[PDB]
Amino acid sequence: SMEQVAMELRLTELTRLLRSVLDQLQDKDPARIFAQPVSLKEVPDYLDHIKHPMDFATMRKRLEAQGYKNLHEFEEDFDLIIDNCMKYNARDTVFYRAAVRLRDQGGVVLRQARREVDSIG
């Protein structure tokens, strides 16, 4: 139908906007701490601690498959990155501190993304 096409074009444009958001968030992780999944070879008990692991490569795969239907879903995944890290790692670690900086710097990006998503529809 023409409606399904129109819906598909909306999703494609949302995907375009979320790709730009993702790139901007990932720039706030210059140490690449959050770039890839926590390795289960290196942290064999990780899944005993963290039930829903997340990282930027995993988000990117979902994004390029047009797997985010709205900004809320995308934000959920970004928040898992931060929140997983802040539980697994202690406050006095470079990992925890990286997550805090990512959260703080990403807030600004996500604030305007919400306005853009609502604005453009």
UniProtKB/Swiss-Prot annotation:
Residues 9-113 form the Bromo domain. Highly expressed in testis. It comes from the Eukaryota. It is found in: Nucleus; Chromosome. There is a cross-link at residue 41 (Glycyl lysine isopeptide (Lys-Gly) (interchain with G-Cter in SUMO2)). Component of some HBO1 complex composed of KAT7/HBO1, MEAF6, ING4 and BRD1/BRPF2. Component of the MOZ/MORF complex composed at least of ING5, KAT6A, KAT6B, MEAF6 and one of BRPF1, BRD1/BRPF2 and BRPF3. Interacts (via PHD-type zinc finger domain) with unmodified histone H3. Interacts (via PWWP domain) with dimethylated and trimethylated 'Lys-79' on histone H3. Scaffold subunit of various histone acetyltransferase (HAT) complexes, such as the MOZ/MORF and HBO1 complexes, that acts as a regulator of hematopoiesis. Plays a key role in HBO1 complex by directing KAT7/HBO1 specificity towards histone H3 'Lys-14' acetylation (H3K14ac), thereby promoting erythroid differentiation. This is Bromodomain-containing protein 1. It comes from Homo sapiens (Human). The gene is BRD1. The chain holds residues 555 to 674 of 1058 of the full protein.
